[PDB]
Symmetry: C2
Subunit: 298 residues, 2 copies
Amino acid sequence: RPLHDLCKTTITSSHHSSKTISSLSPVLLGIVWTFLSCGLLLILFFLAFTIHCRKNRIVKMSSPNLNIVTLLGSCLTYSSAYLFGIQDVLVGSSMETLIQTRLSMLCIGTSLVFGPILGKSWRLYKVFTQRVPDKRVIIKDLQLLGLVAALLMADVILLMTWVLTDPIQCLQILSVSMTVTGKDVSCTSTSTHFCASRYSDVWIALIWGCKGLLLLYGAYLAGLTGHVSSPPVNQSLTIMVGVNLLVLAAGLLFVVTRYLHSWPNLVFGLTSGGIFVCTTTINCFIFIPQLKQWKAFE
Amino acid sequence: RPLHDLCKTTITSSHHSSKTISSLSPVLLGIVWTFLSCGLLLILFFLAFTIHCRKNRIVKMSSPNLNIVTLLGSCLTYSSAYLFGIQDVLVGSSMETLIQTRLSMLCIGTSLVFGPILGKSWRLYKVFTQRVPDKRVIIKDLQLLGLVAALLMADVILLMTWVLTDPIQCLQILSVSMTVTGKDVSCTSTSTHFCASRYSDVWIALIWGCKGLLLLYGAYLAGLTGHVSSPPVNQSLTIMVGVNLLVLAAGLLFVVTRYLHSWPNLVFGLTSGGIFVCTTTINCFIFIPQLKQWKAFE
Ligand SMILES: CCCCCCCC/C=C/CCCCCCCC(=O)O[C@H](COC(=O)CCCCCCCCCCCCCCCCC)COP(=O)(O)OC[C@@H](O)CO
Ligand SMILES: CCCCCCCC/C=C/CCCCCCCC(=O)O[C@H](COC(=O)CCCCCCCCCCCCCCCCC)COP(=O)(O)OC[C@@H](O)CO
Ligand SMILES: CCCCCCCC/C=C\CCCCCCCC(=O)O[C@H](COC(=O)CCCCCCCCCCCCCCCCC)COP(=O)(O)OC[C@@H](O)CO
Ligand SMILES: CCCCCCCC/C=C\CCCCCCCC(=O)O[C@H](COC(=O)CCCCCCCCCCCCCCCCC)COP(=O)(O)OC[C@@H](O)CO
Ligand SMILES: CC(C)CCC[C@@H](C)[C@H]1CC[C@H]2[C@@H]3CC=C4C[C@@H](O)CC[C@]4(C)[C@H]3CC[C@]12C
Ligand SMILES: CC(C)CCC[C@@H](C)[C@H]1CC[C@H]2[C@@H]3CC=C4C[C@@H](O)CC[C@]4(C)[C@H]3CC[C@]12C
Ligand SMILES: CC(C)CCC[C@@H](C)[C@H]1CC[C@H]2[C@@H]3CC=C4C[C@@H](O)CC[C@]4(C)[C@H]3CC[C@]12C
Ligand SMILES: CC(C)CCC[C@@H](C)[C@H]1CC[C@H]2[C@@H]3CC=C4C[C@@H](O)CC[C@]4(C)[C@H]3CC[C@]12C
Ligand SMILES: CC(C)CCC[C@@H](C)[C@H]1CC[C@H]2[C@@H]3CC=C4C[C@@H](O)CC[C@]4(C)[C@H]3CC[C@]12C
Ligand SMILES: CC(C)CCC[C@@H](C)[C@H]1CC[C@H]2[C@@H]3CC=C4C[C@@H](O)CC[C@]4(C)[C@H]3CC[C@]12C
Ligand SMILES: CC(C)CCC[C@@H](C)[C@H]1CC[C@H]2[C@@H]3CC=C4C[C@@H](O)CC[C@]4(C)[C@H]3CC[C@]12C
Ligand SMILES: CC(C)CCC[C@@H](C)[C@H]1CC[C@H]2[C@@H]3CC=C4C[C@@H](O)CC[C@]4(C)[C@H]3CC[C@]12C
Ligand SMILES: CC(C)CCC[C@@H](C)[C@H]1CC[C@H]2[C@@H]3CC=C4C[C@@H](O)CC[C@]4(C)[C@H]3CC[C@]12C
């Protein structure tokens, strides 16, 4: 086949390669940074609220420490959202660790946001509908923090495995492809530049499947604790809203970032919007009833 | 531009090219066929049991109509499992129709298996939680059949959109790709054959996301009804086991059928095993207790 000969013929012309350029509209960057900054101000306000209010009874009911953990997760997610608006500004290898750290912080933030809510719901379950003759004396926060720490350990083990076994090789390939049907023959000259890793679907499937099992157990716990207490401590509504919103946003953003790596503005806007919507919805559902009942107190 | 001419010359140097086909070992086919045959014998046994004893207290309480709908879904699922092993037989254009029909029966069978259980759980919830003065006199079986039919119609709309928008075209592609990572130049020639759509991840994501929302609502419903009735009627355990098994099997089979197209025997065995395990587990969880309390009562 003359394909091997033309191999080395194109290798000479392969001496150079495109270095990529920035094409992210400034206006969009400004708008998304403004909205994420407003969200971060809201998160910091909630952190300050829970720190300053630790003696109110709504505080004791809504487990302020786990809410601090959730707010830290939200801060990580907004940091990842900020880093999403860093494209082609740098020409160095940093893009490698840029994408790596961005996805790592997405995963860590999602785990740190969703673990504490499921832990609170599991206590509520175990302390309300397990009034067995052997009294459930105490199930302290330390146990839930340990469960969240174990989940974070599993997620970060997956992250180390992904990074150290198959990193995000930033490579550009030019290739002529001869797609032939049963009766029709065609040739194409496709040349694309994508920062992706081999076995990408493997890693996406493992991370998303682990998170999916977590979300299924969270939906189960929200079902168990659906009609067991007041909304400030029930957390079933927020668990379900967050789970469906997370599934929808995750699927949409995965499709968009896959099949539309030619519309950088669209991908960035959609990703920032999805992260903002999910994080803000979770934090608002968690904290707004607390504010309402505190204000009703005084 | 310099590669353009070389690629044009290569396309002319096609000379009809060649195609590659192979057959599985006639032992894995036999094992798969006999195991799915035993599964279908079990399903037909449960069908006959429900048809013959739909007058006992346990069977009537266990909603025999929803169970026969589930059994029909299981029969469709094993039919799809059979069609996974008739692959590499229809050499002509029927291969695309084979894959299309196979995946369509997978979707229809999954919907028909996981709809009736959620319908049963929703009635149970509404009859053990509507103590309001507006008595829930009768929530008819026809309403649960209506919901199952609506979900099936939604699945058919999605399948029709997939078939008539971006269908499965079988293409053989041989191409030469030059990978440049910015520090080294590499050339590779690959001749690969696969049957897929141009927007495969779009359709997979949409279908699996709709099914995921269904599974999340099913986990929620299993949570509500988790400690509400007897096992032969609760159906929370079967919902949870089936949902987790379905998620694990779906992810595993996706990864294997994507990244191991050069290992036909492994993909076929794994797909048949996953379908067999999921369907048999669901049907056994549904029906074995019914048999136990029937034989105990008689
Ligand atoms: C949880 C699940 C449900 C949640 C919903 C899931 C998704 C969440 C999404 C929200 C979507 C945000 C709005 C989408 C806007 C995307 C912009 C876009 O897509 O349009 C552009 C065309 O205009 C431009 O060139 C950009 C200039 C104007 C930008 C402002 C327009 C919208 C103004 C403000 C937008 C910021 C919103 C701030 C809110 C909070 C977000 C933190 C694509 O151009 P292109 O890609 O370059 O195409 C050409 C190609 O050939 C080569 O260039
Ligand atoms: C309770 C009892 C039921 C238990 C059932 C267990 C699930 C078993 C199966 C999972 C899929 C089986 C594997 C066959 C599917 C892949 C074979 C195939 O046809 O290939 C496809 C290409 O097709 C398409 O383009 C569209 C596919 C549409 C899928 C329809 C629904 C599938 C299934 C829907 C039913 C379940 C939904 C998800 C469940 C709940 C979710 C947890 C992938 O493209 P590729 O090979 O990667 O491309 C290589 C690259 O070079 C170019 O893309
Ligand atoms: C806290 C409250 C909720 C917070 C809201 C979170 C929103 C989640 C949303 C969207 C995800 C961000 C979108 C970026 C996803 C990665 C895409 C990307 O940028 O790079 C990819 C490639 O990457 C890889 O190679 C490895 C992928 C790593 C995935 C793990 C990331 C950590 C975990 C990630 C999930 C984190 C959330 C887990 C929830 C789960 C809900 C179910 C491009 O692939 P390709 O170009 O198509 O391949 C071309 C082909 O030829 C060769 O591969
Ligand atoms: C819930 C259970 C625990 C969880 C397990 C999850 C799934 C459960 C179920 C089934 C797993 C299926 C096992 C897959 C093993 C087959 C794949 C494999 O591994 O070997 C393949 C096959 O080789 C052969 O052709 C000769 C061996 C044939 C006999 C296989 C023995 C299996 C019989 C096993 C025991 C009998 C059980 C009957 C099974 C009931 C399942 C319904 C080689 O690959 P290849 O593609 O041809 O390579 C060539 C490449 O280089 C270029 O052509
Ligand atoms: C049983 C569960 C909990 C743990 C198993 C997780 C699986 C999916 C993990 C564990 C080790 C991982 C493998 C580690 C090394 C490689 C080699 C690489 O070139 C391809 C990916 C591959 C093959 C990984 C695929 C995913 C993998 C198999
Ligand atoms: C029911 C919930 C909790 C779990 C399932 C949610 C669904 C919608 C999510 C979670 C895991 C995700 C899958 C994980 C594995 C992959 C590999 C990816 O490269 C293609 C899409 C695909 C197949 C994802 C599709 C969307 C997905 C199936
Ligand atoms: C893209 C669009 C068309 C899909 C719409 C998805 C719909 C069905 C989703 C989005 C949000 C979901 C709701 C989110 C929260 C709750 C509260 C819970 O106590 C009952 C279910 C309920 C009410 C969900 C029902 C299904 C729901 C409405
Ligand atoms: C509130 C509702 C409307 C938001 C739900 C998300 C929907 C509407 C979003 C998610 C992804 C979006 C699509 C993503 C990509 C494209 C391709 C582009 O060339 C045309 C627009 C189109 C088709 C977008 C239209 C709107 C869209 C479908
Ligand atoms: C324009 C888009 C992209 C930004 C949307 C911002 C999101 C986070 C905002 C818009 C409306 C807000 C909601 C308005 C009303 C309520 C009801 C309240 O009982 C819980 C909080 C909740 C649910 C808010 C949460 C945050 C919220 C969802
Ligand atoms: C709740 C209902 C309205 C959601 C409907 C979502 C529909 C509109 C989305 C999901 C899948 C998407 C399709 C995916 C694939 C294709 C084939 C492509 O060549 C044209 C765009 C097209 C046709 C998309 C159109 C928009 C689309 C059909
Ligand atoms: C690789 C490892 C992490 C896989 C672990 C899968 C585990 C988490 C899955 C498989 C079996 C599932 C369990 C099946 C049965 C029950 C009993 C039910 O009353 C509560 C849910 C519960 C407890 C499920 C929890 C999740 C579960 C334990
Ligand atoms: C519940 C848990 C234990 C289920 C685990 C299923 C695992 C063991 C199954 C599912 C996917 C399978 C893998 C699919 C792909 C490969 C790559 C091949 O070159 C060696 C076999 C190997 C590595 C298989 C080993 C067995 C395997 C990893
Ligand atoms: C490759 C195929 C043959 C593997 C099949 C594994 C099957 C037989 C295993 C996996 C799950 C197991 C079931 C798990 C749950 C139950 C319910 C219990 O009340 C009776 C035992 C029973 C019914 C088990 C029977 C054996 C079982 C169905």
